[PDB]
Design a protein around this ligand. Sequence first.
Ligand SMILES: CC1=C(/C=C/C(C)=C\C=C/C(C)=C/C=O)C(C)(C)CCC1
Length: 250
Amino acid sequence: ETREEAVRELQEMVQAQAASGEELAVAVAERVQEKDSGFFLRFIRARKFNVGRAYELLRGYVNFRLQYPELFDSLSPEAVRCTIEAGYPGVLSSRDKYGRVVMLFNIENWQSQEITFDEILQAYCFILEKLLENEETQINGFCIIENFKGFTMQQAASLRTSDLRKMVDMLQDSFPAWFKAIHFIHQPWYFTTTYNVVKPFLKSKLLERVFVHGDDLSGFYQEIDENILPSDFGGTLPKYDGKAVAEQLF
Ligand SMILES: CC1=C(/C=C/C(C)=C\C=C/C(C)=C/C=O)C(C)(C)CCC1
């Protein structure tokens, strides 16, 4: 069958490229040796069975793990569960009109000293790994809704550029085939500085996927159905509770 052959070919390419000794190629081979066929199919299907292109995606996925080992080295599924239970980030039970998974983040009362930026990116990665087991999601991908209504100057001033860059690379290196859009709502005037800091690190393809809505959600609701969003993201569903998602994943 085509799938098993495609997976085999990808594996062969991984080995062939590693044989050159090129640093990244060698790391890919080492980092995927425990993976099942399902893992390789995510990349293959995301690139319409084009093996070389699937391999290019795989390189970025591994590169992210090489550059940010602190996110992966001592990952504890139990600790990640607690982060998710606390609502960071969230996940909608329904897909949007594009058939995408919708992820959520509400910065209001986020306290970086209780739940770190890194801990939240670990939760993103943990969730995405699970979600990407699903074959429709492997094609449709996901989006992110950021409610910045409660973004304080204190939070703004404390955001580390290195952390913002880590998030950029998560979307641009680890998950570019699947990250489709990010929608910022209710952001304050000083969001402009924060955006300006990240801008130089964004490829043009990624910039095209960033939307900033302020207080006018008319266009936002054309994209994400109001009737599938929690009340704290402008929707008609109950206030987002991380416990439900947590129980579904674990
Ligand atoms: C503008 C913009 C970004 C900004 C993200 C910021 C501003 C905050 C992220 C969330 C935080 C604060 C999470 C805390 O745990 C990205 C997504 C990096 C890249 C695309 C453009």
